[PDB]
Each structure stands twice: as structure tokens, then as C-alpha cells.
Design a binder for this molecule. Structure first.
Ligand SMILES: [Mg+2]
Ligand SMILES: [Mg+2]
Lengths: 251, 251
């Protein structure tokens, strides 16, 4: 289909789940991809599973590591040429209400879910602007960027932050004619091995009072909207929020 | 009209502008008030200007100071009895795009605008739940919790964070029957001495492409919605955002 002909993408947290599905579909559509993750055993196997080194490689990185972002961009460009596309997908969760969140939990979650997305967005603008690449920054979020969950307080803070920060970046890039778009993607519940590892989680998420479709999604649901946003098909979309949630936020 | 009969309020950043107007109207409506600010020269004059120590006192505090929060709730309880009402109003600005934000600027602004609001909200829930106080946490925000501004990147992140974190807190308090409401307030542009000191700032904010009313607001515009939210008049309002912006976000 070649919908991402010539694109060079970084996908943070690309070795598992949603990130891995995005990476897989990006390679299928002609993009060269650098996936990141915390563990080199998982990451090297993930890249080889998707394609050859001319298509996809792994780079070990914690998205909260500001200095490592520079090496990540350098390694990606050395492998594949100038980066056109950044998917800020790496994220973690803390299962606590605001009331029950420790300051250590707060700082750990914000380091990945907010600081890391800031570091990637800021550096991506600088490295991606003014190169005629049709550059696109896709900031992964979730339904928790729109609605509260009583037991995801810090997570809610991080997703609301990325939702509105992304609009600021989108506007600055558009007003300055940078040729960089910035958008957010908001999955509802998505089946991954990690959800499968939590007894009863999918069953609770599939209740009609949570997901009206009565089931949860799959990683390719998020990969397909990310192909659209990375592609030049979405060249007029910037500062927007794309929800794929089985009806969660419609009620 | 005694709309805040018996209430005991903490107002962070209560020595200037919006915070001082909220403190003034809260005292008029029968609340006891502890205002905070950085500077004891400003804060002691401000409290004395509003009322007697039985009505209003000052407590020196940086809202980023986690231990100081414990001291502030202790001092307010000692002065006035159990705290019923918290206005998280302290905030700062950085005039930078996401691209042009330094990490130091990012961490300085989030320390006040996000961590400080988290510290206050978390402690407020713990100290005001289950006391029959009609407790209310008002998290101050702005139009930049809804829309991007290309030159307020970190500020946008902080306001989006507080917007959705406040919904999480509202839901958990409601579900647990804590008798604590949490809401956000979103001023547009407000005339203050700080705006008056920057030639042409008010004129630019008053252009119809910014504020459709063709002028900016005043601190009492925000004080009046805060009286409503602190009062038992708003006992069914929780998890909501209240915008007072001259039409800014309507276009
Ligand atoms: Mg090949
Ligand atoms: Mg709903």
C-alpha cells in the first residue's frame, strides 16, 4: 500500500503491545522504524520479528532519560536518514487515587508520561522542522486524557497534560510553517499480554457501563489511526485528538 | 449575604490579583481565610487590608513545598478550626513555546502549577473528608486548560494536567462519600497591576480575535464563581470546569 513511503519513524515503547503494532504496520506501509524500550532482550527480538535492519532496528532507552533522546535521534538518522515521524508511546501506570498517590509514585509516572513526551516533542520539533519531510508527532494518550478514573489520579494528570501541551506545539509549528504536525491519539481499553496478566481486568473493561461495545480493542486498532496520522493523508490535521474507545467517552 | 457561613478557606497565592479578590469576597461572605504567598511584606499588608485576624491571616508558603503544606493546614486549623475549602490558585508562567522551553523552565513551572496543586488536593482530601464540612476544592486553571497557546507550552501542560486530575479526585471523593467536591475554574484574560505594567498587553488581549467582548475581565469576575463553588449552593457540582473568559474559547 506504501502509505508511509520514505518515512523514518521513532516509536517509543515500540517493543510491546500498542507500540509494537504501530511499528509492524509502519514497516508494512514502507516506513523505516527505530523502536525503543527498556530491555534489549525483548527489543532486539521484537525488531527482528518485524523485519530486516534496513526496515527496523531497536534502541535501548527510557523515555524519561533526556540525554538519551539525543543519542536516539542520532542513531535513527545514522541508520535510516532524517527522522520524519515520532510516536511518543512509552507510558506507565500507577493504580492509585490522587488521595492515595505517594510523591515517589507521582514523580515516577510524570517522568515517563509527561517529561518523556515533552523531551521527545521538543527535540522532535527541533530535528524534524523545515526539512520538507511531512513531519508528524503523534503523542499517545488515552480516554484518561478526557475523563477521570478515580483510581488513576497521576495517570489522568499526565494524559490531560499531554493532550493540551500537544495543542500548544501544534499551533507553534503551524504558525511558524515548520512542516511539523502534532496530534494526540486516545485509546480506550486495548487487549495486550499485560492486560491478559491481570485476572478480571478485560472482564471489567468489557462491562457495558465501561465499554459500550461490550469488548475491548486490539493493538492494530491504534496502529491504523497512527498510520493515517504519520502519512501525508492527514496533512491538514494538527492540534486534534483522535479517540478509538469502543464508545467509552460517548456516554 | 453570609453565602460562606462557617467556611474555613485556604487560598494559595491569595495576596495578589485573582487570589486576593477571592479572599476579599470570601471574607465578605462570612468565611475565615488563610492566604498564602512568597513574601511576608506583601502578605501581612494584604491580610490586614481585608479584615481582622479572626477573619483572615497570612501564611508564607511556596505551593511547590510539600512539607509546608502540612504546616499551612496545621496553622489554618489552629487559627480558624477545621479547613472546609481549598483554592489552589498559586501559579506561575513561562513565556516559551514547547520547542523553546528549557528543562529548568519546565521543572520550575510544573513544581508550582502541577505538583503544588497535587500536594494541596491530596492533603485537602485527607484533611477535609468525612467531617460534614461541605468541603470544596477549587483548582484554579485558565483558558489554557482547554486551548493551546503557541507561546505557553509548559503552562498549557500544567493546566491540562490539573483539569483532568481534578476530575479523578472529584470522582474518587464522590464514590467514597467523602463530602469533598473538586472543580476547576478557567479565567480568560484578567486585568491586574501586572498586566497594567506591560505596555500594549491589555490592548492585544482585548482584540476581538482574542476576547470577543473586546475587553478583558477583572479579579472579581473569578471571585464570584469561586464563592458559588465554595458555597453549599454548588453541592451537586463536582468534576466540572467553569469558564469565565469573555468568549475566548467559544470561537
Ligand atoms: Mg528489504
Ligand atoms: Mg462518560
Amino acid at each position: 500500500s506504501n502509505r508511509l513511503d520514505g518515512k523514518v519513524a521513532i516509536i517509543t515503547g515500540g517493543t510491546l503491545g500498542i507500540g509494537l503494532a504501530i511499528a509492524t504496520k509502519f514497516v508494512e506501509e514502507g516506513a523505516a522504524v527505530m523502536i525503543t524500550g527498556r530491555h534489549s532482550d525483548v527489543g532486539e527480538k521484537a525488531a527482528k520479528s518485524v523485519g530486516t535492519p534496513d526496515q527496523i532496528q531497536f534502541f535501548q532507552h527510557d523515555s524519561s532519560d533526556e540525554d538519551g533522546w539525543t543519542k536516539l535521534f542520532d542513531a535513527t538518522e545514522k541508520a535510516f536518514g532524517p527522522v520524519s515521524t515520532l510516536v511518543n508511546n512509552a507510558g506507565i501506570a500507577v493504580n492509585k487515587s490522587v488521595e492515595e498517590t505517594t510523591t515517589a509514585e507521582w514523580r515516577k509516572l510524570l517522568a515517563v508520561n509527561l517529561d518523556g513526551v515533552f523531551f521527545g516533542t521538543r527535540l522532535g520539533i527541533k530535528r524534524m522542522k523545515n526539512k520538507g519531510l511531512g513531519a508528524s508527532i503523534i503523542n499517545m494518550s488515552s480516554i484518561e486524557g478526557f475523563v477521570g478514573d478515580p483510581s488513576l489520579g497521576a495517570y489522568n494528570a499526565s494524559k490531560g497534560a499531554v493532550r493540551i501541551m500537544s495543542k500548544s506545539a501544534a499551533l507553534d509549528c503551524a504558525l511558524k510553517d515548520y512542516d511539523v504536525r502534532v496530534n494526540t491519539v486516545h485509546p480506550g481499553y486495548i487487549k495486550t499480554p499485560l492486560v491478559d496478566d491481570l485476572p478480571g481486568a478485560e472482564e471489567a473493561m468489557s462491562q457495558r457501563t465501561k465499554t459500550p461495545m461490550g469488548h475491548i480493542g486490539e493493538p492494530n486498532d491504534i496502529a491504523y489511526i497512527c498510520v493515517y496520522l504519520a502519512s501525508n493523508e492527514s496533512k491538514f490535521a494538527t492540534g486534534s485528538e483522535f479517540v478509538v474507545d469502543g464508545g467509552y467517552t460517548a456516554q
